[PDB]
Amino acid sequence: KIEEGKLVIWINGDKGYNGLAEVGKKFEKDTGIKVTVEHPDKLEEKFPQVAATGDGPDIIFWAHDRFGGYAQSGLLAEITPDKAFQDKLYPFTWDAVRYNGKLIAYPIAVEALSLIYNKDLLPNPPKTWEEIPALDKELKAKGKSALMFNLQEPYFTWPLIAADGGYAFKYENGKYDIKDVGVDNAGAKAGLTFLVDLIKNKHMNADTDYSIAEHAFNHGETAMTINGPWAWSNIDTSKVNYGVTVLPTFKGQPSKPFVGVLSAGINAASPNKELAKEFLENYLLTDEGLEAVNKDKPLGAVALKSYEEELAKDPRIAATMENAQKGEIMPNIPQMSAFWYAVRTAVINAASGRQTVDAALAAAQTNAAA
Amino acid sequence: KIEEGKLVIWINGDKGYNGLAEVGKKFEKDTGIKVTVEHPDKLEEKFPQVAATGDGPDIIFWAHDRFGGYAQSGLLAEITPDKAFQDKLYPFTWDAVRYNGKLIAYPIAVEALSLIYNKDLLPNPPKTWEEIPALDKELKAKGKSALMFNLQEPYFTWPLIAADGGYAFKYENGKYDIKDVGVDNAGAKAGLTFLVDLIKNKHMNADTDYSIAEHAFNHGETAMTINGPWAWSNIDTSKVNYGVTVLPTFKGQPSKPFVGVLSAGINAASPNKELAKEFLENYLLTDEGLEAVNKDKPLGAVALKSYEEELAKDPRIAATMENAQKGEIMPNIPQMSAFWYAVRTAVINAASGRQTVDAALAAAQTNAAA
Numbered sequence A, B: 001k002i003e004e005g006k007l008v009i010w011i012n013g014d015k016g017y018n019g020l021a022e023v024g025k026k027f028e029k030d031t032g033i034k035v036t037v038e039h040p041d042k043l044e045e046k047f048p049q050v051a052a053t054g055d056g057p058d059i060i061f062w063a064h065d066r067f068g069g070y071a072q073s074g075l076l077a078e079i080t081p082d083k084a085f086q087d088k089l090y091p092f093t094w095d096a097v098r099y100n101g102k103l104i105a106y107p108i109a110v111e112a113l114s115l116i117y118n119k120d121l122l123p124n125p126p127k128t129w130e131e132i133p134a135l136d137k138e139l140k141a142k143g144k145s146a147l148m149f150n151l152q153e154p155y156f157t158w159p160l161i162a163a164d165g166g167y168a169f170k171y172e173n174g175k176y177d178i179k180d181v182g183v184d185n186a187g188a189k190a191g192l193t194f195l196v197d198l199i200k201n202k203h204m205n206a207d208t209d210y211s212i213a214e215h216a217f218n219h220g221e222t223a224m225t226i227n228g229p230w231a232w233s234n235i236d237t238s239k240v241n242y243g244v245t246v247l248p249t250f251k252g253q254p255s256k257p258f259v260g261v262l263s264a265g266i267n268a269a270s271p272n273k274e275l276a277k278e279f280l281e282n283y284l285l286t287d288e289g290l291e292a293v294n295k296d297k298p299l300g301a302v303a304l305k306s307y308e309e310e311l312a313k314d315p316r317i318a319a320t321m322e323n324a325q326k327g328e329i330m331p332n333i334p335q336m337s338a339f340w341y342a343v344r345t346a347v348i349n350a351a352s353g354r355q356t357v358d359a360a361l362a363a364a365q366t367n368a369a370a
């Protein structure tokens, strides 16, 4: 069972967990309460299982999309920031963590995928997806490749799927229609078909995952990658001369990455709710707190106004916001877990040649819908 | 086309490529020849495509199993070590690189998978695969897991498949019978069935790859992993107090890891063959040469007798040889690429629920064969 008198925190391991731990040490120094930061694998799936039994972390960090489901299942404590605190963050970030009229998590940062490119290999990155095959031919002749990114998680291919018409659930007047899924319209099909053609024509490998893409980019094996702000720190360390820019267009339309608000929720089963509120409100969501995390691994555009105002001048953040503006904020509805699983299956099956793009997305639509 | 007057080397990125570059620095100093060490993704699949055209690296490093195919395809230079030099390496290593009566690569080191475990989480690691599921249940109660290893590459699952009867090709009197495959007998089925039941019962996850397992073990998230000597370096850098030991038995029989001899072959289209020979014979295959590579990432038991005599005292090396002794040296026949592809497909489909184990191995039996 969750222990009283300490805080256990779960956060994805590609985020600045060491920096978050620094905020934890500061918390312990002031309160005597020990803070343990952990990054279990597949934490976003482990949470619902263990929290159901009254176990797991006091605080869970994830993009807001998963939180509606946690809330519907009664896994989250309703949070109680007063009016002064709420005023400290951008109103739209609060909207992302609202579910059935209740705030169920604290917004931290706004994430969106960007095109990352090696300036020495590619001083002028492609403006369109359509340009990528020829770049790859040219680079292959130098023992390099044009583009590598994670093909195991649908999050990374979604921008291309959505670019020319793909969407998750139809949204009208502040309500998602869970029976109206947009993963199998002409736009979605066109997008995935292009991705699969890249693979068939040997410009990408269906096996490529996050670690393989990161290694390749950071070692100058590939000219481009697609990734979030968290990834910039490792590139800095690699001494690759990189730029961050708008994603390529597809059929003349911008790529539309799903926008995630990194959020922190409080386990409904936690006997440490007040401590968790104190930690999140008085320590983490301050200029000093977000600074420590961000210095470890960049957060992106933070929810805290005072600190975003000082990050805003960073061109990498301007590119992130530009890509966010072109994309869409993720739904937070409970149906999202089913949506993602359906799209992951379709992309893997189509990329590997197990099913046609059309069969893959037709099953995803059915699987995702109610 | 391959440039005259330099050496380009390809080696897997998880091995000691920076150490190897150091050997290259000394080679340049004595011979005037610059050495470039590269670690392309999927280098062992890319090599035959580019080599057939006269392109690629001067020297390729990979386990010996891939080299029969390269040699049969006309892509490797026959090597010419005199008897004095041949006497410096273990006779069985030369056997691994002999194909159609010709030596086709220089043996470097002998690799075998071992069980690696965290002595603090699990001071008493299992003697059997069979006690793993309950150990996992027990570790889950403490917020950890029992075992994580790469489920994307069949190499890592093979020891379990073979433990109780699985095999690649029937071997008799120095000849492999390529029409007699053993991936679909009672033993192979039992092995794969145990693995799939692990995943089914949430003791492992089918998506787990090399980077995920390494991250998990090196951060104290899981009590055990399965990996080779090259992995020990990063574990040393980690906080983890670890041990390396014999793999668990299955149905009472030892796990049977395929044993690879890391070997260096010379591209048949290299205009630098004499230089490649001098590099490999007079620089790399010396105590000082292998020490430089080994200090970067452990090689395993090396092929050079003089140096292996110094490494043999290492209990990690003792465990490596014990597991190797219980396993089988891989065939080097051209048919091995089709074997591995067939097995990869079977494990991924079985582990993910796409096919039953029986249907997966039934298919693999026929695909692997001729």
Ligand SMILES: OC[C@H]1O[C@H](O[C@H]2[C@H](O)[C@@H](O)[C@@H](O)O[C@@H]2CO)[C@H](O)[C@@H](O)[C@@H]1O
Residues within 6 Å of the ligand: A012, A014, A044, A063, A064, A065, A066, A111, A153, A154, A155, A156, A260, A340
């Ligand atoms: O791939 C599906 C996955 O997408 C999103 O997860 C992101 C997460 O938002 C990012 O912060 C980062 O960690 O990468 C993840 C993708 O690997 C959704 O948030 C998630 O629910 C969904 O499963």
Ligand SMILES: OC[C@H]1O[C@H](O[C@H]2[C@H](O)[C@@H](O)[C@@H](O)O[C@@H]2CO)[C@H](O)[C@@H](O)[C@@H]1O
Residues within 6 Å of the ligand: B012, B044, B062, B063, B064, B065, B066, B111, B153, B154, B155, B156, B260, B340
């Ligand atoms: O997984 C199939 C794969 O197994 C072997 O590859 C090993 C290699 O021998 C090791 O040195 C290390 O790099 O890990 C590899 C597995 O990821 C075979 O040598 C290879 O041909 C085969 O594809």
Ligand code: NI
Residues within 6 Å of the ligand: A013, A038, A039, A040, A041, B215, B216, B219, B221
């Ligand atoms: Ni982790």
Ligand code: NI
Residues within 6 Å of the ligand: A215, A216, A219, A221, B013, B038, B039, B040, B041
């Ligand atoms: Ni590499």
